[PDB]
Amino acid sequence: KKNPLKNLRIMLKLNPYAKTMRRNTILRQARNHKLRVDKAAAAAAALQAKS
Amino acid sequence: KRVKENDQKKKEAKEKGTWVQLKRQPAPPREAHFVRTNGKEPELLEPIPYEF
Amino acid sequence: MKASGTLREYKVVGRCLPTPKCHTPPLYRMRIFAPNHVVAKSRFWYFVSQLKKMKKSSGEIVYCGQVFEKSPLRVKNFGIWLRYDSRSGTHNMYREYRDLTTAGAVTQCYRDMGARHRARAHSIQIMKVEEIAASKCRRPAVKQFHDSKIKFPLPHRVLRRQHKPRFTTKRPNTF
Amino acid sequence: AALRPLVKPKIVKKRTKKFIRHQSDRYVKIKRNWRKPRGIDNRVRRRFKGQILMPNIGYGSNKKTKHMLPSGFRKFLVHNVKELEVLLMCNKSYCAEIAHNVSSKNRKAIVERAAQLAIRVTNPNARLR
Amino acid sequence: GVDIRHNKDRKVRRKEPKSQDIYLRLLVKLYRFLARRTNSTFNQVVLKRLFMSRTNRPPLSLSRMIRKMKLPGRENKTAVVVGTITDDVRVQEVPKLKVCALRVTSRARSRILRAGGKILTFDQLALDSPKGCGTVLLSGPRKGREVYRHFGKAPGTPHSHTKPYVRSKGRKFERARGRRASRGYKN
Amino acid sequence: EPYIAWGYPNLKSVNELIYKRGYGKINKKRIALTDNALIARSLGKYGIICMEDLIHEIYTVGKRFKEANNFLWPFKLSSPRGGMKKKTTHFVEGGDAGNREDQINRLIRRMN
RNA sequence: UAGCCCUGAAAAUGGAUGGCGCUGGAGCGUCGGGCCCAUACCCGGCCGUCGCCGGCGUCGAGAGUGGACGGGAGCGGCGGCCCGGAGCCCCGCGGACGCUACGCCGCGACGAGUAGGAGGGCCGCUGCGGUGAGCCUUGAAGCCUAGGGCGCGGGCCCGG
RNA sequence: AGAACUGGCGCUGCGGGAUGAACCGAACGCCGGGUUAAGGCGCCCGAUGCCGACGCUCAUCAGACCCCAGAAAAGGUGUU
Ligand SMILES: [Mg+2]
Numbered sequence: 001k002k003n004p005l006k007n008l009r010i011m012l013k014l015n016p017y018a019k020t021m022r023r024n025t026i027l028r029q030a031r032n033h034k035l036r037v038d039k040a041a042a043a044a045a046a047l048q049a050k051s
Numbered sequence: 052k053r054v055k056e057n058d059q060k061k062k063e064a065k066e067k068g069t070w071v072q073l074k075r076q077p078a079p080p081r082e083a084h085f086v087r088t089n090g091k092e093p094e095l096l097e098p099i100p101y102e103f
Numbered sequence: 104m105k106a107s108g109t110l111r112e113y114k115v116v117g118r119c120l121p122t123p124k125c126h127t128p129p130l131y132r133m134r135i136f137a138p139n140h141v142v143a144k145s146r147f148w149y150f151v152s153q154l155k156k157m158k159k160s161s162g163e164i165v166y167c168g169q170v171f172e173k174s175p176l177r178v179k180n181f182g183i184w185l186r187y188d189s190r191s192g193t194h195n196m197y198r199e200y201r202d203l204t205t206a207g208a209v210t211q212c213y214r215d216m217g218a219r220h221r222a223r224a225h226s227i228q229i230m231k232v233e234e235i236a237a238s239k240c241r242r243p244a245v246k247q248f249h250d251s252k253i254k255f256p257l258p259h260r261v262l263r264r265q266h267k268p269r270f271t272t273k274r275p276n277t278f
Numbered sequence: 279a280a281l282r283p284l285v286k287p288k289i290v291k292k293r294t295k296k297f298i299r300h301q302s303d304r305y306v307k308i309k310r311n312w313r314k315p316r317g318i319d320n321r322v323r324r325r326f327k328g329q330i331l332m333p334n335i336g337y338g339s340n341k342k343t344k345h346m347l348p349s350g351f352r353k354f355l356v357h358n359v360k361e362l363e364v365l366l367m368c369n370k371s372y373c374a375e376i377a378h379n380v381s382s383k384n385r386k387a388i389v390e391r392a393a394q395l396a397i398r399v400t401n402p403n404a405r406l407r
Numbered sequence: 408g409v410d411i412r413h414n415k416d417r418k419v420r421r422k423e424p425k426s427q428d429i430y431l432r433l434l435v436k437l438y439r440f441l442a443r444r445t446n447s448t449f450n451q452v453v454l455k456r457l458f459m460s461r462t463n464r465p466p467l468s469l470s471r472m473i474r475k476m477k478l479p480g481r482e483n484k485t486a487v488v489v490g491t492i493t494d495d496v497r498v499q500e501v502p503k504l505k506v507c508a509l510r511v512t513s514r515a516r517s518r519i520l521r522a523g524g525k526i527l528t529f530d531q532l533a534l535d536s537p538k539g540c541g542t543v544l545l546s547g548p549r550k551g552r553e554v555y556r557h558f559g560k561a562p563g564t565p566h567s568h569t570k571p572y573v574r575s576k577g578r579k580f581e582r583a584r585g586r587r588a589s590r591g592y593k594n
Numbered sequence: 595e596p597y598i599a600w601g602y603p604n605l606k607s608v609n610e611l612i613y614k615r616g617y618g619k620i621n622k623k624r625i626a627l628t629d630n631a632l633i634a635r636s637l638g639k640y641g642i643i644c645m646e647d648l649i650h651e652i653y654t655v656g657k658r659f660k661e662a663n664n665f666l667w668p669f670k671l672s673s674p675r676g677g678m679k680k681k682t683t684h685f686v687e688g689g690d691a692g693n694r695e696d697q698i699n700r701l702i703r704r705m706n
Numbered sequence: 707u708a709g710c711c712c713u714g715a716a717a718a719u720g721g722a723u724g725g726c727g728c729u730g731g732a733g734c735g736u737c738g739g740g741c742c743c744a745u746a747c748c749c750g751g752c753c754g755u756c757g758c759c760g761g762c763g764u765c766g767a768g769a770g771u772g773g774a775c776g777g778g779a780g781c782g783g784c785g786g787c788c789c790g791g792a793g794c795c796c797c798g799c800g801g802a803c804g805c806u807a808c809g810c811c812g813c814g815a816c817g818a819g820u821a822g823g824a825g826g827g828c829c830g831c832u833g834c835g836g837u838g839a840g841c842c843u844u845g846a847a848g849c850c851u852a853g854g855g856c857g858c859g860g861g862c863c864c865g866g
Numbered sequence: 867a868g869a870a871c872u873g874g875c876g877c878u879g880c881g882g883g884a885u886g887a888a889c890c891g892a893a894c895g896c897c898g899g900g901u902u903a904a905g906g907c908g909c910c911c912g913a914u915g916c917c918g919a920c921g922c923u924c925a926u927c928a929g930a931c932c933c934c935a936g937a938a939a940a941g942g943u944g945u946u
Contacts, residue, residue, distance in 0.1 A: 001626040004613040014613075014630055014645045086118065086130065086165050093116045093132035096154055098228050100195045101186055105688030108738060141695050145686040189708060210737090211920075217736035218921035219946065220709055224736075225687075261730055263917040292752080292896055297859070312859060318820070318877095325818085325879050325894080336817085336895030337858035338753035345856060353856075355863065357840060375864065383844045400854090401864060407844090408746085408893055409816075416756045416816075423808075436807065440762060615748090622758065623814040672748035673902040681891085681903060704901095705748095 104146065106213040106224040110136050112171065112206045113143040117164035119157045130165060131155065136209045136229055140167050150228075172204045180240060181208035184230035187222045199242045205232055279349065281398045284370045286350030292337050300330055347373070351398055358384065359391050366395055373398035382406070421458040431457065431509075434529050441537060449539025453529075456489035464490035465547030469515055470498040472506065475545055487532070487544040494518055507532045507542070563594050596682075599690050601698030608653050610706055612645070617667040624667045637665050674704040 004011045011018040057073050064071045118130040133150060137143035144167050148159040172179075178201070185196035200215075202208040209232055216222040240246045259277050298310045300322045314332060315323045322330050345352050351373035356362050357380060365372055374397050376385050382405040392399045424431060435457055441450040456464070467488040476486060485505045492508050494515035501518050507527040511519070516526055527535070536542060562571035563585055573580045584591030603611075618627045620636050627633060627645070634643040640658040642648050651662045683689030685697070694701075 001628055005610065010628070011613075014628075017646070081163070087127075088130060093130050095132050095134070096151075097133070097231050098150055098153065098186060100184070100230065101193050104686070106736075107688060139697070141693075141697060142686050191708075194707075214736050214920050218709095219735085221735055221922090222709090259730085265915040266917050269915070290752080292858075311861075314859090316820090323820090324877095327880075333858045334817095334895060335754045335858060336752085336897090338896080339858075340752060347855070353863075357838090360839085377841080378864065379841055379846075381842065381844055384841090386844095404865060405844090408818090411816080418757080432808090436762085439807090443760075444762090619814095625814075670748070672900080673746085675901055677902065 104137060104142055104224055106210070107138045110138055110206045110210045110213075111143075111169055112136055112209075113140060114166065114168055114170035115144055115147045115164055116166040117144075117147060117151070117162055119155075119162040131157075134170075134232075136206060136232075140169075143167060171206075175204055178203055179208075179234045180237065180245060181205065181232060182235045182240075183209060183212060183232040185212070185216070185227060186230060187216060187220065187227035189220070189222070199235075199240060199245045201245050201248065205234075208232065281396065282370075283350040283373075283398070286346075287343055289343050289346050289348070291339055297333050298330065347400070349373070349398075349400075351400075353400060356388070359388050362388055362391055362395070362397065365397055369395065369397040373400055375400050376404065421455075424458045425460070437530070437533060441533065445537055447538040447540075449542060449544070450537075452544060453487065453489060453539070459489070462552070463549060465549045465551060466491045466493050467508075467545055467547040468493050468495050469501070469518065470495040471547070472545060473498070473502055473504060476502075476504055476543060481543055484541050484543045485527070485532070485536075487539075487542050488546065489544075490547060492516075492519075565594055567594065595684075595692045597691065599685070599692065599694065599698065599701065601694045601696055601701075603653075603702065604696070604699055605653060607699050607702050608649060611669055611702070612649050612652070612666075615669050615671060615706055617670075618665050619667050633665075637661065671702075671705040674701060676704045 002010050004014060008019070008022075053075075060071065060073060113135045114132065115135050116130055116132040118128045119125075121127065131151060133147055135143045135146050135150075137146055144164050147164060148157075148162070151157045151162070180199070180201050182197065182199045185198055187194060187196060198212060198215075200208045200211045202211055209229060212229070213224050213227070216227055217224070237249045240249070257278075261277060297312050299308060299313050300315045300320070302308045302310045312333065317323065322332060325332070347353060352371070353375050354365060354368075354372050355375035355377050356365070357377050362374060365374055374392060376388060376399065380388070385405055389399055389402050392402075424435060426432070435454075438450055438454040438457060442454045467490060469492060472486050472488070472492065475481075476484075485507055488506075488508045490509055492506060492511040492515050494512065501522040501524075503523040504519075505525050505527070506519060507529065509529070511526055519526055532542075556570050557572065559569040560567050562569040571581055585594055587593055616627060617624050618632065618636075619625070620632075625632060630644045633645060633648055637643075637648070640661060642651055642658060642662055648662055648665075650656070651659055652666075656662075678690055680689035682691060684692040685694045686692070690701075
């Protein structure tokens with residue numbers, strides 16, 4: 001008994017939706033990560049443009 | 052009484068076409084209901100001191 | 104109750120069930136000090152059953168949230184009322200502390216009742232807690248920190264042994 | 279190794295220590311042959327700690343490795359040529375022993391029949407001149 | 408420990424006969440092939456009946472069989488009994504039924520073969536109907552022995568009807584007190 | 595309630611239990627349900643023919659909860675790696691034997 | 707009033723928070739973060755018992771959870787002059803292991819034990835019928851042995 | 867000494883209670899890794915060698931952990 005949640009592709013043997021659930025929560029947490037790092041730079045960008 | 056008002060209610064579902072589920076159940080957990088504290092605010096009670 | 108760790112104030116309201124005789128009972132409110140919310144709604148049915156004819160089977164709680172002090176930064180003076188039990192009889196007690204939060208002042212009670220009076224935390228009942236302002240304190244241990252331009256040094260400092268070499272060639276100054 | 283016997287695994291054994299009878303150290307009337315103690319109070323049967331262990335079926339060896347010699351064969355003791363030839367289709371799995379009664383003349387002959395058939399004998403050089 | 412209770416681990420039935428009959432042991436090998444392989448429940452009944460003891464294989468007389476084959480529907484089936492077929496003196500004429508049994512007796516198979524019937528062993532039953540189709544499998548009165556009328560509550564309890572162990576039937580052998588209301592009591 | 599600890603599990607509690615420590619019984623055997631065939635071949639009568647359908651009846655307590663539960667062997671969990679507290683008094687009293695109503699999810703992740 | 711302490715508080719060998727000791731605690735009360743280890747619990751190995759079974763298909767030609775023929779009518783497909791038709795293996799003559807069926811294989815769960823009860827013993831001793839074209843003065847039985855092993859064990863085998 | 871109810875010991879080892887029949891955990895085929903229960907972590911003695919938190923207490927007989935192996939009424943301008 002290889003472990004689901006510990007490797008892929010046993011989950012996908014038991015649950016095919018688990019992959020398309022998983023790259024969606026890699027795609028969207030990377031677009032919330034590109035957003036916030038760009039946003040936090042854009043606050044101190046104009047604050048550094050001031051001085 | 053139930054066997055009596057059970058069998059007649061069983062053939063009432065034959066003429067009407069339903070799934071009335073005459074088997075009895077234990078008490079389920081209480082339904083997600085909604086209380087209303089209309090106007091007022093709840094009463095603050097606090098433990099009384101000891102006097103003999 | 105164990106009074107495990109630092110406590111946490113909860114506002115718990117609840118009401119006995121609507122009977123066919125009684126519709127809409129008035130939904131009482133208490134102020135439970137407990138380490139988590141599961142103990143907090145367990146002490147509500149301890150205190151309500153001593154005050155009204157209610158119990159957990161024929162009642163339910165309809166709120167249990169952490170209610171927290173507004174001013175966690177301002178230093179406040181707390182006076183609380185106690186109903187502990189002793190080994191012989193039971194006594195009422197007023198008792199004053201001085202903390203930045205309400206749940207930290209009642210935590211400072213349970214520790215202090217066990218320290219001075221050896222009273223285990225199941226035998227003591229908090230009646231009410233509120234901030235008092237200065238010049239209404241009666242305890243001279245709380246009163247002595249009401250001093251603008253207060254100052255005091257730290258004599259005879261001792262700490263961090265074995266942290267450094269247990270074996271040193273150096274007699275450690277206590278300043 | 280004069281001969282190699284098919285697959286020889288790592289022979290594990292659970293114990294290499296030869297179970298002794300209780301109180302066999304203290305007396306010499308008591309042989310070291312195992313007899314289980316059935317007294318009503320003794321501390322070996324009741325199985326206290328730090329005392330003489332008593333054998334049970336958990337100490338049994340692996341089935342694919344049971345009766346394996348350290349050379350990887352399994353002995354089958356023979357008496358003459360006519361029962362050496364019965365081990366011809368087992369020669370990479372089993373090995374022959376010559377019984378201790380076989381005279382030095384006949385033992386010389388049933389080891390030369392063993393070398394033609396390439397069957398391992400465990401004691402080839404026994405009772406020589 | 409687990410607390411899953413003891414005595415549920417072991418079953419106390421028979422997995423092979425205790426006979427050393429090399430002709431019953433080949434009948435066993437024939438039918439425990441057919442039991443695990445043909446998927447018919449006739450071959451499971453016959454297989455566990457070959458394992459049974461001699462007391463569990465009571466003899467079946469000739470007129471229990473032909474009385475249990477005058478029934479409607481049984482007109483062309485074959486009678487299986489795992490055990491002997493003896494013959495009744497009580498029956499006068501024998502129908503032409505087809506039987507199949509271990510060890511039919513000598514006077515019985517003279518009366519079955521005069522009637523025109525055919526006796527079979529369990530070999531040529533297996534060639535005939537491997538599923539066991541069209542067979543009426545019979546049994547003898549396994550509680551018809553003299554031993555079972557000694558079993559029950561007690562012979563000296565109320566309404567026992569248990570037939571005690573006396574060494575000889577007659578007057579003065581277990582008939583005096585406890586058996587009549589004049590002498591002592593009556594149970 | 596002197597001998598048990600229990601409470602109301604959330605969705606990933608049963609999700610972690612059914613996958614990791616989940617086992618099934620067919621007739622008398624404790625099998626690893628490592629295939630969706632093994633769920634369907636016995637309990638497929640009730641339309642709960644896959645793994646995540648089995649996980650749906652047993653969280654949202656559905657019509658066939660009973661036969662979905664009794665399919666499962668009892669969850670043979672490990673010892674709680676954070677340690678326990680006192681094991682003999684109530685969770686209210688400071689120990690842990692009894693109802694705790696959502697803190698069992700915190701306990702499963704140490705158990706499971 | 708009640709917490710800690712003290713007075714009240716006296717016994718015979720020399721002596722006991724277990725001991726040494728311990729007073730910014732190694733004491734008492736209330737707590738926190740760690741950390742320690744049972745034969746328990748979880749994963750894995752192996753033995754055994756018990757439970758449910760598997761293979762007589764050694765079927766390299768066996769193939770079947772639906773199956774044939776041969777006729778009444780239609781296709782898609784394979785070879786066109788829109789007419790169309792069973793090939794039985796063979797350039798290799800080949801293809802492991804098995805199943806003492808009382809044997810073999812597979813999965814799953816379990817394992818304390820006095821008195822007591824059953825089972826298995828290729829555990830052992832003496833004697834008999836059979837049987838090993840057994841063994842032996844080129845050395846039997848016995849006895850000895852820091853010799854070599856096997857068996858969980860009862861024990862056994864081998865070297866000197 | 868004798869009853870009731872449940873468990874246990876007798877038949878039963880193991881961890882903890884220094885020691886132990888019955889107490890507290892916990893039941894046992896032979897092992898490796900993991901983790902815990904009850905209990906603990908100055909040194910014997912595995913683990914507080916944490917910059918642990920807050921108080922209480924000084925004894926010229928301190929005190930110190932279920933069962934459990936020593937004590938009361940009364941009193942103390944001793945401290946809180
Ligand atoms: Mg005893």
